Amino acid sequence: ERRRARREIRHLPNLNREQRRAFIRSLRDDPSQSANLLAEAKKLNDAQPKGTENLYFQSMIDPNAQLTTAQLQTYGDLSMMEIYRNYHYAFTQQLMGCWNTTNYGGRHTLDNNEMSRIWTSFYTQSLKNIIDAQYRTAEDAEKVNINSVLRIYRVYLMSIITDTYGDAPFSEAGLGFLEGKFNPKYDKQEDIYNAFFLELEDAVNKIDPTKDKVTGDLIYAGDVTKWQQLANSLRLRFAMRISSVNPTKAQTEFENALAANGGVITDASSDALIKYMTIAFSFGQEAYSDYRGNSLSQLLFGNDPANNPSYLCSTFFNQLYNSGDPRTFKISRCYYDGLMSATSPDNRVDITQEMIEKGIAFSPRDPGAYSWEPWPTGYDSDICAELAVNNPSVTATMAREVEPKLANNFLKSDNPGVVMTSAEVKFLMAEATVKKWNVGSVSAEDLYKQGVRAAIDFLTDNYGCTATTDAEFDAFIQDKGAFGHTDNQKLEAINTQAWILHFTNPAECWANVRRSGYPKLKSPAEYGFGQYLTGGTEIPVRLCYPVLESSYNKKSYNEAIERMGGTDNWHSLLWWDTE
Amino acid sequence: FNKERRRARREIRHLPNLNREQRRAFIRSLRDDPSQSANLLAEAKKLNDAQPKGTENLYFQSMIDPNAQLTTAQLQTYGDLSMMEIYRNYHYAFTQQLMGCWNTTNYGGRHTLDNNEMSRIWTSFYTQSLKNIIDAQYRTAEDAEKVNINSVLRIYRVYLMSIITDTYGDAPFSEAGLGFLEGKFNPKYDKQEDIYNAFFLELEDAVNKIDPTKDKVTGDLIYAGDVTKWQQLANSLRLRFAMRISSVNPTKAQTEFENALAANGGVITDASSDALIKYMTIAFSFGQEAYSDYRGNSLSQLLFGNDPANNPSYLCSTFFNQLYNSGDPRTFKISRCYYDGLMSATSPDNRVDITQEMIEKGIAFSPRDPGAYSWEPWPTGYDSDICAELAVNNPSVTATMAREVEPKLANNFLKSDNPGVVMTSAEVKFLMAEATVKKWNVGSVSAEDLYKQGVRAAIDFLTDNYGCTATTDAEFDAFIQDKGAFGHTDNQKLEAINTQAWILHFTNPAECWANVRRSGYPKLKSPAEYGFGQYLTGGTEIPVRLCYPVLESSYNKKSYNEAIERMGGTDNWHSLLWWDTE
Structure with missing residues (x-):
């Protein structure tokens, strides 16, 4: 039969x-x-x-061009990036103060349309197109490389979806065009993670440099050996992710990936970074169909950049400042923006060094706080007083300018899209070593310090930040950057440093905070904003499914929420998020 | 040619x-x-x-060629499920052809201003098809080896822009699509008068630039690349736009109309040149993947409904009574009364047709007045013998009919493979008939004969393209000799012509609304005159345009301000479009 x-x-x-x-x-x-x-x-x-024009002979976009589009959409989709500014960066307590960030994530506002953006963008575009392109090139000896790369990127996109929502379509996703099936079941997250390992393993073993040339790769320019390193490094990420819920499998999968063909990302020259180009920052209609620039950087600059910039959250700024972290003022600056353009971060006045010389306190925003609440104590700026002589619109008394802001280096259309870094691999190795897995002979402390060093160099290499010297590094790492002398101290240190590293990777930042428990974030209620938390006191641990699915994919959705006790609740822990 | x-x-x-x-x-x-x-x-x-x-970023990998951009634009015209909501929500209520479905009554039937629902044509076209067509047009412009794809793109650009301006009025055109091309994301809103001037010039040049000895058009779902038929479409559009401006600029309208008739290729004179987008049969879904799938007719999907058991497409009384009271042979081709208790959720199969039963028992049809819901007012029902027998074997079936006595859109119009109507030969006849009544120099056929030819072609259009039962010569003659007749005065003749065009444009809601506004026929009354005035939050008169997306005010402020200043400082959907005059 x-x-x-x-x-x-x-x-x-x-x-x-x-x-x-x-x-x-x-x-x-x-x-x-x-x-x-x-x-x-x-x-x-x-x-x-x-x-069939009416199908396929039209937009015969080949499998390689689907790879390009999918990579571009990952951080280029201006509608999708809103989710990170609204929710993730508040939940990880790295940005706070911008109206969007405080209102939604900082004050636990349930908004189904805002929560739906990853679901909508991926299942209507890149995940659907990747799945179609994967099947087009499947079981074809002459296309094993593009097929394997698509399989690896399919896993990566799916990981963002399941780490956001939980159970979700995967095995049946994309089958409307392929098989006439428009109502996909939600695979269990546990099964999704099982499939991740199997797919990444097989993709690594099918890659063969003697076969087809990968032409639309904006990450590795077609270097399929680096794609094996990425796949094996993603296996380490997902192995560590499931280390609380399934320790035995986690260890096995972690050790298998280290021994696989190609190895893992051991060095920054194999970092997985999507290349974006410089285009104008626009919030007009046509900008929503252009994925060539980094739209996360656009959003962090802001649709209202003078009054709602990316202010830093006190949790993140104080971790950096109070630890003497050299990245403190690589990541953040205090700016006077009175002469700043409406469409680019030009003509800002950097007052950071003046604040330091005069001993002015920095005033980052507690979780739940707007830039205007609490209103900070300012100071009289000599730089701006001198500017005001030829620019009469300039004020010389600073107020909210003493609230640190995201530095210009992170507000560029050509900022890269971070997929995974060697620094993360070090931190994953360091934690695997503290858990006593068999991952080589290198000590957890040497791996931790290598990760911290790589994470600092990462900002210098990819965002133009000032270099940190060996002596500056040694001063930090020998004091408040130190590894610790218990297991819990070491796990805290490792994952507090991963959190800093993942600032430019908000999906991974939120996943590892929830998984590791570090840093130990407190509800905005503990900072005095508990009366505003309409969606509950505790920081959400997932996002809810779109209302659309409840009406138009009803059976599948009902199956999914019954596995969570009958409700779609953003306080409901994901399968891999356990004590 | 100036120094700078x-x-x-x-x-x-x-x-x-x-x-x-x-x-x-x-x-x-x-x-x-x-x-x-x-x-x-x-x-x-x-x-x-x-x-x-x-290169790679720019174009060089994701290079959808200009012919593929044509295919995508044609597919989007009726295949874009998010966009099609605007027609069910607003157009079909404003033209008083559908009423009763929650969406149609709430938004269009009760004049509810909703920015997001009004925005759908604007956002869909300027982010996708109009932007893509403009980029493809520039890529093929001034190139002797691509004059055919270039001319076809210019014609379809005009068609898509005509939907936009007939919806919203002044709108980006000359500066549209220049974000990728120039870094210019803040386009001005061209005045509608100037947009319409550019339509005639573009269509004329496109017709003259086509050359069958040059490039093959390969992605064309309308004419399979037949460039002479593209000329006929372009010249027929010139007739459409000429008649559109016949009130605001009678002299230009007459000249443009007569010019188009004599242009190379002629106009659409026969149904074998009707401009119809080919759609295929795909499943009706409102899930995520369906919103990026343009292969099927999404208008038909919506008229079936996302809530088809409780909110099907109920006919408005203005439209149903026009058909019923005039003896129109299409009355029960376009509408039936259906019991849907056993109907599937994803297809109009297994409906029980009770129309004949209702006629035999003398049950009054109860189509929905403008403003009415299917449940308000509640209709007078009856005891169905057909459903009583069904209910013995299916306890979920009701024997008592209620809202089933309200005529519904027939299954023929609820098919994924329904065509996307751009322009028909029947419309050309109606345009010819009206141009003759106005005494323009357009041929030797009498206006009455052209009218009769349009009515015949509009009826056969349903037979040929929707599988409706054919209408016989005897049925046609009995209709046309009685209530379907042409009339004796000019006003009677103009009323007959544009009332018949209104029926024809049922499956073309953009053109339907434009011609109702332009011609004044049929003479529609506000829902206030049917007793629903207290619900008309957006004002009492039937809107004559839709508003711009509010975010144009934030991110295209200077251009948006210039446009609303011409309406007195406000984005007024009671403000007449430039071509809509007494």
Whole structure:
């Protein structure tokens, strides 16, 4: 029955290759559905008469160009990036004060449309296109590289979805075009993570530099050996992610990845960074269909950049400042923005050094706080007094300017899109070593210090920040940057430093904070804003599914929320988030 | 040709990093506004500097070619599920063809201003198809080996822009799509009068530039690339727009109309040249993936409904009574009364047709007055023998009909593979009939014969494209000789013509609303006159346009302010469009 059905599907004249491969894979995965799958395939065949402009001969965007589009969308999609400014950067307590960040994430405002942005953007565009391109190139010896790269990036995009929402479509995602199935079930997160390891393992073993050239790669320019390092490093990320919920599997998967073909990312020259270019910052209509620039950087600059810049949260600024971290004023500056352009961070007046010379206190925003509440004590700026002689609109008394802001280096359209770094690999190795897994002979303390060093150099290499010297590094690492002398101290140190590193990777930052428990963040209620937390006191640990799904993918959604006790609650812990 | 302009053009032709469509756009902007030469030159240099190695980012991998951009634009026209909501929400209520469905009554039927619902054509076209078409047009412009795809793109650009301006009025056109091309994300809103001037010029030039010995058009879902039929479409659009402006500028309208009839290729004279976008059968879904799938007719999906059991497409009384009371043979081709208790959620299968039962028992049909919900007012029902027998074997079936006595849109119009109507030969006949009544020099056929030909073509249009039962010659003759007749005075003839065009445009809600507004026919009354005045939060008169997205006020403020100043300082959906005059 199964073999008869496969032959008939191979011989349907009007299916395209990705449709055929999808049906054949579904036959393998679920042989009982042979009769059903065969009938759906015939229906699809009958509906697609010859010479299909009306389908596929149009926007015959090839698999490599889907890779390009998917990489661009990851940080280039201006509608999707709103989720990070609204929610993630507040939940990780790194930014606070901008109206958007304080209102939504800082004060626990449930807003289903704002929460839906990752779901909507990926399942309508890049994850759907990657899945179609993966099936187009599947089981084809002459395309194993583009196929493997697509499989790796499919896993990466899916990891953002499941780490945001929990159970979600994966195995059945994208099957409307491929099989006429528009109502995908939500795979269990545990099964999704199982599939991650299997996919990454297989992709690593199918890559073969003698086969097809990967032409649309904005991360590694087609270097498939680096793609194996990325895949194996992602296995380490996902192995560490499940280390609380399934310690035994976690250790096995972590050790398997270290021994796999290609190795992992051991050095910054194999960092996985999406390349973006310089385009104008616009919030007009046409900008929402241009993914060529980093739109996260655009948003952190702001649609209201003079009055709602990216102010830093006190949790993050004080960690940096009070520890003597050399990145404190690489990541943040105090600026007077009275002469700043409306569309770019030009003509800002850096008052950071003046504040330091005069001993003025920096006033970062507590979780829950707006820039105007509490209103900070300022000071008289000599720099701005001198500016005011030829620029009469300039004031010389600073007020909210003493609230640290994201530095200009992180407000550039050509800022990279961070996927994964060697610094993270070090931190994952350091934590695997503290947990006593078999990961080599290198000590956890040497790996930690290598990670901190890599994370500092990361800002110098990719964002133009001032270098840190060996002596500056040694002063920091030998004092408040030190590793610690208990296991809990060492885990705190490692994951407090990963948190700093992941500032430019908000999806991973939020995942590792929730997974590791570090740093130990307090609810805005503890800072006095508890009366404002309409969506509950505790910092949300996931986001809710779109209302759309509850009405138009009802059976699948109902299955998912019944696994959580019958409700879709953003205080409900994800499967891998355990004590 | 002015000193600053020519110096700037030369420097731009020399900038090494602009691609071809970017260079052509800057050149065209210099022609259109020579005073901006210094500005344009500076934005060109900025753009050049930002594109050093570029290529892959720019275009060179994701290179959807110009023919594919045509296909995508045609698919989006009716396949974009988010955009099609605007027609069910507003147009079909404003034209009083559908009423009763919650969406149609709440938004259009009760004049609810909702920015997000009004924005859908604006956002869909300016982020996707109009932007893509403009970029493809510039990429193929002034190139002798691509004059056919270029001319087709210019024609479809005009068509998409005509939907936008007939919806919102003044709108970006000449400066639209220049974010990628020039770094210009703040386009001015061209005056509608100027937009319509550019329509006639563009369509004329496109018709004259087409040359069958040059490039093959390969992604065309309307005519499979037949460039002579594209000329007929372009010339028929010239007739449409000529008649559109026949009240505001009668002299230009007459000249443009007569010119189009004599242009190369002629107009659409026969149904075999009807301009119809081909859609395929896909499943009806409102899930995530369905919103990026343009292969099916999403208007038909919406008229079936996201809530099809409780909110199907109920007919408005103005439309149903026009059909029923005139003896129109299409009355029960366009509408039926259906019991939907056993109907699937994703397809109109297994409906119980109770129309004949209602007629045999003398049950009054209860179509929805403007303003009414299916449940308000509640209709007079009856005991169905058909459903009583069904209910013995299916306890979920009701034997008592209630809102089932309200006529619904027939299944023929609820199919994924319904065509996307751009323009028909039947409309050309109605335009010819009206141009003859106005005494223009358009041929030797009498206005009455042209009218009768339009009515015949509009009826056969349903047979040919929607599988409706054919109408016989005898049925046609009985209709046309009685209540379907042409009339004796000019006003009677204009009323008959545009009342019949209104019926024809049922499956073309953009054109339907435009011609109702332009012609004044049929004479529609506000929902206030049917007793729903207290619900008309957006004002008592039927809106005559839709408002701009509010975010244009934040991110395109200068241009938006210029446009609303021409309406007195406010974005007024009671403010008549330039071509809508007494």
